[PDB]
């Protein structure tokens, strides 16, 4: 009755194992995890308390390639195979996707104790924005930072920003090599070149003020670019490894935050605190409820985070608006008639209040945000085992949850002919977003308690965007001026480009070129330039 001999042979086998030729050893160093991963999945598939897990061949990598390149196609296939809740492996992580409005509710309205945005995002955002702010702090601190920033984002602020943003757009038409409207009546433009510039110029001028806008006319502008390079998904996978673009990122965060602090300290020194810009607002309103004041460094870092939050979302959105309208001269025409009607043939200066009487313009923004949600996936890290109603699924701590309102934006069930750009689907519904009932306040103002709307370009729950009205103001002014000034169309044989999903936002695949032409070739934009 001897197993003893077999145990001897276990030991022997280990010894012969260690003595394998490097050919066999490398071979087995690959072959063991490969096999184990596979039997682990087959085993995993037997659990009834886990959502189905998308099958994958390469350990750790998982479905990263297909998810990374075509997330909506990936989701549609998974949704056909498994239904609305399913998991997939992504560079060492397990992501549980919950598609549709029930998913919106499951993730956006998740208990503070159940999930963490900062645990999913901080390793990426902290090196770019700086310490102490956004995701480098407890959620309660984030809630109050959002309150502080919202305090510079009032209707009175927007009334004052509208002419500043209009001035910037006109200067860009006058001065940018991309246009030069006083010298050229037609031209070709890459919207992924122009829109990020127009976006940072307009947002700098209004939120940060004249000094910081002036800085963007210099080599200082390059820092923003560098800062931008730290804000990509390789950093999402490697938050730090020793590469130059990381160092340029850190340097840029320091130099830019340094410039912000210099202005702030100069203002406090000269008692030159007004109500002009978000800087003046944070200088007056940045004490948390426990009485601790944000430091000047944290104020600057928060300024960087806020501007970054508006930068890629807004730039991508105006790129897509231009791109969709480039093949819809009927829509340009309709928007132009609205401009002439609301602004008395141009004899009225554009104001914030008049932007609110441009429903077609606002529906154009809304519809572009439907077809092109800038963020295809939003994440949380699961901190406590979560039960999914009405199921037997448990999402264990250590998993991530992924919600995709932009995928639902593109489903025929919620938006008939979802792949058709139709601003009129929003007729009698021009609002950037509508809370369809009860509200709740997480610390930065009353917002919709339910997050079941199939349309959620600005998310929902405690992490909801606070920049929505700024974005509509900025996009509104910008597009109002584009429409009143220019007609545009595609080069022959060109059409709307497919999205690039690999980037930080779902921007168009470039070069995405449009040809513009002046509606009034003889019109001059005044003011001095060199």
Tell me which residues in 452-511 interact with ligand HEM (CB under 6 A). Answer: 457-459, 463, 465-467, 470-471
| Smallest distance, ligand HEM to C-beta of residue 374, A | 5
Tell me which of ligand LAN, ligand HEM, none is bound by residue 125, counting a contact when its beta carbon lies within the kind-specific cut-off of 5 to 8 angstroms.
ligand LAN
Pick the piece of the chain touching ligand LAN (CB under 6 A) from 262-270, 301-309, 364-372, 424-432.
Answer: 301-309
Task: Please say which residue, 117 or 169, places its beta carbon nearer to ligand HEM.
Answer: 117
Q: Give how many residues touch ligand LAN by CB under 6 A.
A: 15
Shortest distance in whole angstroms from residue 481 CB to ligand LAN: 26
Burial of 192 from C-beta contacts in 10 A (0-12 / 13-18 / 19+): buried
Q: Of the two residues 121 and 516, which places its CB atom closer to ligand LAN in the complex?
A: 121
256 binds ligand LAN (CB under 6 A): no
Query: Is residue 309 a known part of a binding site?
Result: yes
b/e map 398-412, b = 16+ CB within 10 Å: ebbbbbbbbbbbbbe
In the block, tokens 């940018």 appear at 176
DSSP string, 143-166: HHHHHHHHTT-SHHHHHHHHHHHH
The radius of gyration computed from the CA coordinates of the chain, to the nearest angstrom, equals 26
Of 339 and 377, which CB lies nearer to ligand LAN in the complex structure?
377
In angstroms, what CA-CA distances link 235 with 116, 426, 492?
19, 38, 38
What is the x/- site pattern for ligand LAN, positions 177-216, by CB under 6 A? ----------------------------------------
* Beta carbon of residue 470, minimum distance to ligand HEM (angstroms, whole number): 4
Sheet holding 486-489, edge to edge: 186-190, 513-518, 486-489
Cβ 318 to ligand LAN shortest distance, Å: 17
Reduce the DSSP state of residue 515 to 3 states and report it: strand
| The entry of ligand HEM, ligand LAN, none that residue 233 binds, CB within 5 to 8 Å by partner kind | ligand LAN
Q: Which is nearer to ligand LAN, 125 or 257 (CB)?
A: 125
How far the first Cα of the chain sits from its last, in Å, is 99
Our measurement of the distance from residue 394's CA atom to the centroid of its chain's CA atoms, rounded to an integer in Å, reads 29
Long-range contacts of 172-179 (CB under 8 A, 24+ apart): 172/197, 172/198, 172/201, 173/481, 173/485, 173/525, 174/525, 174/527, 174/529, 175/529, 179/516
Judged by CB under 6 A, which stretch of 91-99, 147-155, 292-300, 377-385 contacts ligand LAN?
377-385
Q: Return the residue of 127, 187, 309, 450 that touches ligand HEM, per CB under 6 A.
A: 309
Tokens 């061949």 correspond to what residue?
A: 57
**Contacting ligand LAN (CB under 6 A), which of 133, 164, 300, 308?**
308
Q: 71, 209, 310, 508: which one contacts ligand HEM (CB under 6 A)?
A: 310
Helix pair 191-203, 155-175: axis angle to 10 deg: 130
**Contact in structure between 85 and 98 (CB atoms under 8 Å):** yes
The single residue among 125, 202, 235, 433 that binds ligand LAN, judged by CB under 6 A, is 125
- Residue 161 known to bind ligand: no
Q: How far is the CB of 465 from ligand HEM (least distance, A)?
A: 3
| Nearest by Cα to 232 from 347, 312, 178 | 312
Q: Which residues are at the interface with ligand LAN (CB under 6 A)? A: 68, 121, 125, 134, 233, 305, 308-309, 375, 377-379, 501-502, 504
Q: Can you say which residues are annotated as belonging to the binding site for itraconazole?
A: 309
Q: Can you say which residues are annotated as belonging to the binding site for lanosterol?
A: 121
């Amino acid at each position: 009755s001897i197993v003893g001999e077999a145990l001897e042979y276990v030991n022997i086998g280990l010894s012969h194992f260690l003595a394998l030729p490097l050919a066999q050893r490398i071979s087995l160093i690959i072959i063991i995890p490969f096999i184990y991963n596979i039997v682990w999945q087959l085993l995993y598939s037997l659990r009834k308390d886990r959502p189905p897990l998308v099958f994958y061949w390469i350990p750790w990598v998982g479905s990263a390639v297909v998810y990374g390149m075509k997330p909506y196609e990936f989701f549609e296939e998974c949704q056909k195979k498994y239904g609305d809740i399913f998991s997939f492996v992504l560079l060492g992580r397990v992501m549980t996707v919950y598609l549709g409005p029930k998913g919106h509710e499951f993730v956006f309205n998740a208990k503070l104790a159940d999930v963490s945005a900062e645990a999913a995002y901080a390793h990426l955002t902290t090196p770019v924005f700086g310490k102490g702010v956004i995701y480098d702090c407890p959620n309660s601190r984030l809630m109050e930072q959002k309150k502080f920033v919202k305090g510079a984002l009032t209707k009175e602020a927007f009334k004052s920003y509208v002419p500043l943003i209009a001035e910037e757009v006109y200067k860009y038409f006058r001065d940018s090599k991309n246009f030069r409207l006083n010298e050229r009546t037609t031209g070709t433009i890459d919207v992924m070149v122009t829109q990020p510039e127009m976006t940072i110029f307009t947002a700098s001028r209004s939120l940060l003020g004249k000094e910081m806008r002036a800085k963007l006319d210099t080599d200082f502008a390059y820092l923003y670019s560098d800062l931008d390079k730290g804000f990509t998904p390789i950093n999402f996978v490697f938050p730090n490894l020793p590469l130059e673009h990381y160092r340029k990122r850190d340097h840029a965060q320091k130099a830019i935050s340094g410039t912000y602090m210099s202005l702030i300290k100069e203002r406090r020194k000269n008692n030159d605190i007004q109500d002009r810009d978000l800087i003046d607002s944070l200088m007056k309103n940045s004490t948390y409820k426990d009485g601790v004041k944000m430091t000047d460094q944290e104020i600057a870092n928060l300024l960087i985070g806020v501007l970054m939050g508006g930068q890629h979302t807004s730039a991508a959105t105006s790129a897509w608006i231009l791109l969709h309208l480039a093949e819809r001269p009927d829509v340009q025409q309709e928007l132009y008639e609205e401009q002439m009607r609301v602004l008395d043939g141009g004899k009225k200066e554009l104001t914030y209040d008049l932007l609110q009487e441009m429903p077609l313009l606002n529906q154009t923004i809304k519809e572009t945000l439907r077809m092109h949600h800038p963020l295809h996936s939003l994440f949380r890290k699961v901190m406590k085992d979560m039960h999914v109603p009405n199921t037997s699924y448990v999402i264990p701590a250590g998993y991530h949850v992924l919600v995709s309102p932009g995928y639902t934006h593109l489903r025929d069930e919620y938006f008939p002919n979802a792949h058709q750009f139709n601003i009129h689907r929003w007729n009698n519904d021009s609002a950037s977003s509508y809370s369809v009932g009860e509200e709740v306040d997480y610390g930065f103002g009353a917002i919709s308690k339910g997050v079941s709307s199939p349309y959620l370009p600005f998310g929902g729950g405690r992490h909801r965007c606070i920049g929505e009205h700024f974005a509509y103001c900025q996009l509104g002014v910008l597009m109002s001026i584009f429409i009143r000034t220019l007609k545009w169309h595609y080069p022959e044989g060109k059409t709307v480009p497919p999205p690039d999903f690999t980037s930080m936002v779902t921007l168009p695949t470039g070069p995405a070129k449009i040809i513009w032409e002046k509606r009034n070739p003889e019109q001059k934009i005044g003011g001095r330039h060199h």
